[PDB]
Paper text:
The Haemophilus surface fibril (Hsf) is an unusually large trimeric autotransporter adhesin (TAA) expressed by the most virulent strains of H. influenzae. Hsf is known to mediate adhesion between pathogen and host, allowing the establishment of potentially deadly diseases such as epiglottitis, meningitis and pneumonia. TAAs, which are part of the type V family of secreted proteins, have three major types of domains arranged in a linear fibril ‘lollipop’ structure. The two binding domains of Hia (HiaBD1 and HiaBD2) have also been identified in Hsf; unlike Hia, however, Hsf has an additional binding domain (HsfBD3) and three putative domains, the structure and function of which are unknown.
In our effort to characterize the full-length Hsf protein, we determined the crystal structure of trimeric PD1 at a resolution of 3.3 Å, thus providing the first insight into the molecular arrangement of Hsf to date. HsfPD1 crystallized in the monoclinic space group C2, with nine monomers in the asymmetric unit. The individual monomers of HsfPD1 are comprised of three distinct domains that fold to form well characterized TAA domains. The N-terminus of HsfPD1 spans 29 amino acids participating in the unexpected formation of three β-sheets, βW11, βW12 and βW13 (where ‘W’ represents tryptophan), which share considerable structural homology with the C-terminal TrpRing domain. The KG domain is composed of two β-strands, βKG1 and βKG2, as well as three α-helices, αKG1, αKG2 and αKG3. The C-terminal TrpRing is composed of five β-strands: βW21, βW22, βW23, βW24 and βW25. All domains participate in extensive intertwining, where the C-terminal α-helices (αKG3) from each monomer come together to create the central core of the trimer interface. Since our construct contained only 29 N-terminal residues upstream of the KG domain, and as TrpRing domains typically consist of ∼55 amino acids, the structural evidence suggests that our N-terminal β-strands constitute the latter half of a TrpRing domain.
Residue numbers in the entry:
A (entry chain C): 1607 to 1697, 1703 to 1744
B (entry chain B): 1607 to 1697, 1704 to 1744
C (entry chain A): 1607 to 1623, 1625 to 1697, 1703 to 1743
The structure:
Amino acid sequence: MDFVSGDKDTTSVTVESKDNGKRTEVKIGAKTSVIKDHNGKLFTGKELKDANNNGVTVTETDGKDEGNGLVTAKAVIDAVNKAGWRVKTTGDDFATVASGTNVTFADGNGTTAEVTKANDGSITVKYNVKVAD
Amino acid sequence: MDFVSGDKDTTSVTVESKDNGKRTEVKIGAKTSVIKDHNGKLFTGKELKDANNNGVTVTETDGKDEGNGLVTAKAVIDAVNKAGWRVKTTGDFATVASGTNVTFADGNGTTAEVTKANDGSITVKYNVKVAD
Amino acid sequence: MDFVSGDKDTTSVTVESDNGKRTEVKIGAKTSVIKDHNGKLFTGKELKDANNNGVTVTETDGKDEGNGLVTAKAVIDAVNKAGWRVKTTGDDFATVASGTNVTFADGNGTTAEVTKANDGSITVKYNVKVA
């Protein structure tokens, strides 16, 4: 009887006999991959390790990770929670706006901010000008 | 022959002999975790159940879920589709999820101009309207 | 002696034998593909049955209801192609995905000011330029 896996990356089955005889244990585990991220954009281990060098510290085990294995709930959740779109900050680079981050469209000098949300969920942002007298 | 699993959270293997005498069935399954969300931010079961109290009803089974198990496609899809960034509503916050249309329109004495570069980068610019 | 799986969609266990005496047991994990359209994530069946325009979905993915597990690449590719749409005046709509730079620039008689607080909260304000 042989025990082989469908996909070597998703499922890992190893048979050992660490009892020096007659006791054959079959270890069945799920190989999981880690999801990385940078500048609000999700990256794999190999991509982030090979393409980016600045400000990032990637381990050797994560460096060889090409993201072909499965993922847990926590990994996905944290990945999305660290992912989003970047906005240009004036004072002159970029700031990462992830999911759940509050963005307030306020009014300033001689302007009137009007941000509305329809029942369909569609967002309409509009600025007005006030000219009296 | 022994049948043990690598990780108890990702994989669950149970050996039983309930199917009558001499018939020993080995059930091998993958333990999956559920993904929750609130205000466009993804939370685990335990996180959503324990941190937030208002307007939310989380079951006891989901309350103990720490998200150490695997996840299915539909769960991830719905989670992302219920996740996004919040905007201040002037009338108090509104959740902007994936795929929802955000229209930058112009109003009184203003001119909306939203352009899309080849890089995919969006440039939003407002103008003032002074004719004659 | 039976080898059965808990969920047929998440886990697949098959016992096979080509001639006599060699019985191999293949255990693999059935994975589902995550699709997307207009920045919104869809399953295989949903995209295939509900959407007709501009999209070509295979039959194997057409029956996919997204009940199986997912790999890292699938999730990563799915999220990075998902996001929120903005009205472009050229018009129509434009899909803004994750990691995409959105610059609030100033124009005629306007002054753009986008600031980021310590909380990470973004405050965008427009000013008027009257010299």
